[PDB]
Design an enzyme around this catalytic site. Structure first.
Site, PDB file in Angstrom:
ATOM      1  N   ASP A  67       0.857  -1.179   0.000  1.00 33.05           N
ATOM      2  CA  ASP A  67       0.000   0.000   0.000  1.00 33.05           C
ATOM      3  C   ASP A  67       0.903   1.243   0.000  1.00 33.05           C
ATOM      4  O   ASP A  67       1.900   1.300   0.758  1.00 33.05           O
ATOM      5  CB  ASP A  67      -0.871   0.019   1.256  1.00 33.05           C
ATOM      6  CG  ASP A  67      -2.206   0.729   1.139  1.00 33.05           C
ATOM      7  OD1 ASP A  67      -2.209   1.965   1.006  1.00 33.05           O
ATOM      8  OD2 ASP A  67      -3.249   0.054   1.278  1.00 33.05           O
TER       9      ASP A  67
ATOM     10  N   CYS B 251      -7.488   4.233  -1.549  1.00 30.99           N
ATOM     11  CA  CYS B 251      -7.309   2.795  -1.273  1.00 30.99           C
ATOM     12  C   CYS B 251      -8.483   1.880  -1.685  1.00 30.99           C
ATOM     13  O   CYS B 251      -8.263   0.904  -2.404  1.00 30.99           O
ATOM     14  CB  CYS B 251      -6.884   2.551   0.175  1.00 30.99           C
ATOM     15  SG  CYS B 251      -7.006   4.013   1.255  1.00 30.99           S
TER      16      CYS B 251
ATOM     17  N   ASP C 268      -0.728  -0.364  -4.622  1.00 30.90           N
ATOM     18  CA  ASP C 268      -2.116  -0.006  -4.899  1.00 30.90           C
ATOM     19  C   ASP C 268      -2.241   1.414  -5.534  1.00 30.90           C
ATOM     20  O   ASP C 268      -2.887   1.586  -6.571  1.00 30.90           O
ATOM     21  CB  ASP C 268      -2.912  -0.095  -3.592  1.00 30.90           C
ATOM     22  CG  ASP C 268      -4.391  -0.053  -3.816  1.00 30.90           C
ATOM     23  OD1 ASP C 268      -4.944  -1.065  -4.292  1.00 30.90           O
ATOM     24  OD2 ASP C 268      -5.006   0.979  -3.491  1.00 30.90           O
ATOM     25  N   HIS C 269      -1.598   2.411  -4.908  1.00 32.87           N
ATOM     26  CA  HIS C 269      -1.619   3.808  -5.346  1.00 32.87           C
ATOM     27  C   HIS C 269      -0.316   4.436  -4.889  1.00 32.87           C
ATOM     28  O   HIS C 269       0.408   3.826  -4.090  1.00 32.87           O
ATOM     29  CB  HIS C 269      -2.840   4.558  -4.749  1.00 32.87           C
ATOM     30  CG  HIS C 269      -3.057   4.284  -3.289  1.00 32.87           C
ATOM     31  ND1 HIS C 269      -3.894   3.260  -2.861  1.00 32.87           N
ATOM     32  CD2 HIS C 269      -2.452   4.829  -2.211  1.00 32.87           C
ATOM     33  CE1 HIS C 269      -3.754   3.209  -1.547  1.00 32.87           C
ATOM     34  NE2 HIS C 269      -2.920   4.155  -1.110  1.00 32.87           N
TER      35      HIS C 269
END
Lengths: 506, 506, 506, 506
Positions: free
Chosen positions: A10, A50, A315-316
């Site tokens: 993450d 998220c 994820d980002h």
């Protein structure tokens, strides 16, 4: 013989693995894997934050299709996902961590626990270790059993103050490195995977770190000197950022150094503060790497490394002070540009991909590799051609991302300022070889960034000299939305002999 | 106490009730109802053809949301519709005719009859009389029992040839007027409604006529002289039509006078032929009118007229030779502009609405009037404020329509000529006060029609003088798509106390 | 503040806690809990084996209602259970171990892992630790990480042979006591429960031990001397057992000492062998007790003991050599008579219940205590009146159990001998104050055991002097089946105002 | 090619077609069909009344399995039925009449019309003509349109009084014979079937007549002289009937001549009254017969007679004054014994079956004949072997029926007098070659009727000379319940390769 290891880090920036920040952080295990596999250099999240990003990664669809547009926005119960599709292939999808899935209220009783959290595991996933940021009960019980004193879960994230009690920004975490959230989740993976060896397994391991509240255990807290790090890429002041587009007023205010740590409510965004948070974040990334090496070592030791599809991504992204902003609730590339490493038996080791790839391309890659039918609902395309150093002739020439700046029950800073409702909160980004276009559903003007000019550092949409580029890119964006509408049943046909289906991608 | 009478005439042009063709056709019962009710003059179908256009009317959603984008394209089983929502209000939705609903293959056995026809009745509707064009078993049996000779259903639509056996284009139908499809359906409504009086009923009555194969029973067949009718609005030749945009090549070639009648395979599109078909069509509209008068007379006779919400509309339009084309697989207004009459107890009689209204506004109007919750999935807005001569301040300033020019199993004429696949078949239309913009998902240029200039008779999209109007309207079209994405669960929120919903419409 | 601790000990006899075997085994923690709570002395499983028994305990229904009559027989997906009902009360049902639930094929894809095992967790349960006998992956990985050498899971259960390599029946387990299956599951409960303290939790802890393959770690393997234990209750030979009813021929053959251990295929059923297995079983029970004390100590230490509903029971009994048979695929009481201890805040400590109670009474007791609606489908009745030393005036005066002696794909020893099909495999038992009646669906005569005479040691059904008792008990059994048919919807009524329900028990 | 014509006459006694009453009624069309087909002489309804008895016929299951045990008791939504199974075979089940199905509240919105009536059509059936006794809107509208004067639906059933206004018991109906309920339904079948010819159709036609309120149109009302009819089979007085078993007290008091007609509230049960009702009932059966001849004539005329599976039966019987009782809420054979005629291409014409057959055998016969898989849930067995004059060696040797004498919201006369609740309302009947046994779930003694002795005219259950017969038959009844438990999933097995099924019937 045919295993799937899907790791999601993450909030890790692409430039930490390779790029502007790479020389300021040690990531040996991730860099060793990239050296023995395929790296994707133009990989972007299709949405943010998220929740919508994970929804897109796990369903293979754009936010405009899956419609889980914000954290807490429910995802349809019948939405095909990587777990449901892998279950059809005979796999039990093992979960170590979280999926951050907002459940469908139509599929549960009103009072069910699954409808009380947007961190709840996605349908089809078999949870082995629960490690959701707001509820890490196995990790919290581990710290309590270890003899750590804490009356509240929030106290765990407070950096150790000085001997005299003075709060210290990069103070070591209250837990030792061997007792950390990263170490504990890796230990749970290694405590459960040995008996799965031999059989075809699918393990989904999700690391929260690097991520706020920014705190790292000794020695990672101070491993990187904030005084030797590069400063963020930004215009001189916060008001210069807001001057580029009124959107940036609420964006630079949404998150701050003070909201990225616990125990510093009045924390000033000085260069000393910004660089310290940046050093703590990078130390948390080296900690993740260290534990990923143990996961790789386990595969090699069991002779399962060569027979496993390994997928490593973030994820980002994270602004990290860039453009006087923090987090991912913005339109700049750093919030979406994510690392991607794919290792498959027979892939070209050290191969580097430059073509635009999207987060939605992960689910179809896995299904293709296991030999399971990819549903028509999946907007993404298999990255399998790139694994043997090739590419499909009809590939995307641009990438697409979405954001929602509305909140149905609690109006956002953008809604309070600009006055739009929760049906007009959608934002869209199109990344062309030269330009980046930003378009709002709300009555806010577009953004246009010319990479042959000042790049992201100047919004040129109001310049009449760029009117033809603006019109061309916006039509390209309009066409993308029209070419990627919900394909769940749109390729099925009711005939005199019954229902017949047409495959989306050949 | 609270009745709902929802009549839908298939293929009736708005200009036949009021406009260019109104003085060439007798519609006394529809015009008497308009005189005692509210007429909507800028009412447009949001999609085409019949199936998609029926799916939008019955669900209150744009085709981009409901996704039944072509005839035979399945509609999701869990899609809220007028019947399912009226059932929640305690109504049994009575069906007299058809819904043309393509069923969800996920909701039925592979060999189910419901999956063999796209004319199948929609979930929630209680069918009293089956009357679908390709079936009509009650009407076919009425014909056999009355002693009509026909070895095939297609023989019923062949106009009576001359005494010498010479085929006659406007020859009277095989069946007498009292035995017609229009008369028979009206008779079935009147044979079943008497016992429903007193109780709260919801009746849905659907007349196919005026609709091909064009044939009218005596005296309707020749009631209008083709020699005294105005010629269609068109450019001199077929090549002038197609010179305006390449889309019109396949669009003028899709339908023809020869495909609009049975028994004339080599029928030439002469002015004599075109005017004859036009006279037959107007004669069928007059016969629909006479039978609607009987439906109104029944309500008055039973004292149920003043206590009933009456909704009269058409699903889509008909080119009728206009622009060298037939049917509704085009982008011109005549294919979408439909009549709309709404009578409700306490409405302003003779009130005329000029604001843009859409086919998706019908379902929320009915639900509002009965006092039933309108689902958030519904894109349309209640027309109830207009009934008392008022108008909401935040109402529509443009109308929006969609079309799909692709077919998954059998490529269309547009697909064959332009080379795009079934993910790129979408067309979108935006009707502004001055302009009409047409945008394609496929690599075909936009269309721009200036209503202060040549109207629809000249595509001005390539004119540099209209580049700023083109860019402005296309952004308005882009924003409409972004403001009207799937709202099924996007306004629901997962909170610490459970799932909470936000009302879509103000 | 309102917690539920539901412990199931698989295969523990009621007479080990209190009765014939109690003085030959140390169970201090279970006996200390009984001293501070309510003990149920006439508690019987309503069905057998493990699967049907668990189905009944977790659904609160008889096997004749839930119909999961054998191991592997699917349970309907919509069957209300303790987890689904507790989820309605806001609880997340935490699972440590197994439920042995055969999933509904109608609810899953044909190739789903959930349809490949009858040990799969029941719908609604949130699995924290998987510990299914045929798959104990966390425990198997623990042994591998500990440095235990085993190439097959079956090798783990082989007792340590002598120094010279001679196989030893009561040889210590290959794992140390701290690394045992019992210890490991308790450790997983204690590694996960600390963070749940304060909130309302529901934890379901399922111990497999005592259970075959009979092996105990040092010092439990030899803690009890086989030479000082009482011999099983049995007639002189195996043929004397089969002479009582032909049913006992296949029953005494179904299981044997040789099938109850691993590494002894030719094991003779001598008194030395039988007593050794009996001593190993009792040592495994003292091991369970020891670990249950740690669970109790945790509740006391956290101050959660007084505010918790504690339910301790065994799923089914075990013959343990009694009547020349092993296991629970028989009709004698030892296969069904199970211990039951219930502690609730404000209960009468040391209260002993003598009334007949059934395994199906557990689910309604829990729901009642939490204040959640008990579904009408539940055949069992809440034991809450007995907790305050009282009893309901309309209580059962007999207990009822069922068994199925057919197997659809692989005919059982009973089917091979007697020649019945898989629709006639049902057996029913009625325990009256004086008599026990056994009735077969197949063409096998009843059994009748007179407790005022020879008890279970003589089948008296063929005696004409017992014809009136036989007829009276069989009518009582017939009435029980007729009074306990599927109540899912049988108490609901379709009225002119809608569906109205009637509560099963007042 | 393969048609299915399923006719169900409500309340027609078996003895009217062949037996004690046959010589007192004209049934030429039913007797002509029997002469050209297979007649089943020992055919019994497995449950009562209409709702339960219709649920058994349409599902092929005993009431103990389907659980729709009383009128208004919901049937599970996922219960396989003749329509759902025929839909899998590609048939559209056409309904002409009613199914009397109580819908599952779990499958509909609380306010749905489907949950307000227990006369609602069963899932899978496509209703062509609605004709339920408490509704009949098409027939009521036919009556208003033909100019019949009635301000209430109940006025339609009042027999025409004398010229002076004196009420007349066998007065002709308000409507002429050509406008009757029987004639109208037949007309609706004939108005809709012609267009179905050639295609494979499944038509379900349900005549309510003969059924209360007893009224017949001229000349049927007086066609049979009540003075020339035999008197009912009964004991001299009401107290003689009730002396046989207390059940008959409430059973003779449940229905009466006064409740079987409209307009006679104080109607005395004299021999004149009883015989008049009996003559009216027989007259309605003759009118049903005349209209069935028209249905047969249609099949012959269209050349569809030889290629059609024709099934003619009654749902249940009618006491018709026999044993001082009316209706079917009793245990005597006249309430269950129903006619059954089956014609199939290639059957033995004039073949008479004497073996015990059950109402549940109809659904599997139809499925077998069309070549569609019979679900394991179906308790009934195909009658197909009997059609070619054969008989299976393992066929039924007794018949079984059930009744429920409890009502959850409004306690019945039996509940009021005997004091049992709605879980103890079940009654079971076993018809052996010599005896008939009746057993109650409630604390009421059994009934035993010896057909070699006094038959049904003497309950011999208390006679010590019949104690062994009573015990033997009750064990046979106990075994039947145990051999016919819910088979939906009990023959399915969870294996290492997935779920595998075993066929129920040989």
């Amino acid at each position: 013989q045919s295993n799937v290891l899907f790791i999601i880090i993450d909030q890790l920036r692409a430039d930490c693995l390779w790029g502007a920040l790479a020389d300021h952080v040690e990531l040996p295990h991730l860099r060793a894997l990239a050296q023995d596999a395929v790296s994707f250099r133009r990989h972007y999240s299709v949405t943010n934050p998220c929740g919508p990003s994970r929804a897109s990664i796990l369903t293979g669809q754009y936010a405009m299709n899956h419609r889980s547009v914000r954290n807490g926005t429910p995802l349809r119960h019948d939405t095909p996902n990587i777990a449901t599709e892998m279950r059809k292939a005979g796999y039990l999808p093992l979960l170590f961590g979280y999926t951050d899935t907002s459940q469908d209220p139509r599929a549960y009783d009103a009072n069910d626990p699954a409808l009380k959290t947007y961190e709840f595991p996605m349908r089809g996933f078999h949870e082995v270790t629960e490690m959701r940021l707001e509820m890490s009960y196995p990790w919290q019980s581990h710290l309590k059993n270890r003899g750590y004193a804490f009356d509240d879960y929030a106290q765990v994230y407070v950096p150790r103050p000085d001997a005299d009690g003075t709060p210290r920004l990069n103070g070591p975490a209250m837990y030792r490195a061997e007792d950390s959230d990263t170490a504990f989740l890796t230990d749970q993976f290694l405590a459960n995977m040995p008996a799965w060896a031999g059989q075809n397994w699918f393990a989904h391991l999700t690391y929260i770190r690097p991520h706020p509240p920014l705190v790292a255990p000794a020695p990672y807290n101070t491993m990187y000197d904030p005084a030797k790090l590069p400063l963020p890429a930004r215009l001189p002041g916060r008001d210069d950022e807001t001057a580029e587009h009124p959107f940036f007023g609420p964006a630079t205010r949404y998150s701050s150094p003070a909201s990225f740590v616990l125990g510093f409510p009045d924390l000033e965004p000085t260069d000393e503060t910004i660089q310290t948070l940046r050093a703590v974040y990078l130390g948390l990334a080296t900690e993740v790497d260290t534990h990923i090496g143990r996961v790789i070592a386990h595969l090699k030791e069991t002779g399962q490394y060569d027979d496993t599809l390994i997928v490593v991504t973030a994820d980002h992204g994270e602004m990290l002070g860039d453009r006087h902003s923090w987090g991912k609730m913005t339109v700049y590339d750093a919030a979406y540009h994510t690392p991607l490493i794919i290792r498959a038996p027979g892939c070209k080791p050290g191969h580097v991909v430059e073509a635009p790839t999207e987060s939605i391309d992960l689910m179809p890659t896995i299904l293709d590799w296991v030999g399971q039918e990819i549903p028509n609902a999946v907007d993404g395309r298999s990255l399998r051609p790139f694994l043997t150093g090739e590419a499909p002739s009809d590939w995307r020439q641009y990438s697409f991302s979405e954001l929602d700046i509305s909140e149905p029950l609690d109006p956002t800073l953008w809604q309070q300022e600009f006055g739009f409702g929760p049906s007009a909160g959608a934002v869209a980004i199109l990344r062309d070889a030269r330009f980046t276009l930003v378009e709002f559903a709300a009555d806010l003007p577009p953004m246009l960034f010319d990479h042959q000019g000042e790049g992201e550092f100047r919004n040129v949409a109001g310049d009449p000299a760029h009117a033809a580029d603006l019109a061309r890119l916006s039509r390209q964006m309009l066409r993308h939305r029209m070419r990627n509408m919900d394909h769940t049943l749109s390729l099925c046909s009711i005939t005199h002999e019954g229902a017949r289906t047409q495959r989306r991608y050949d």
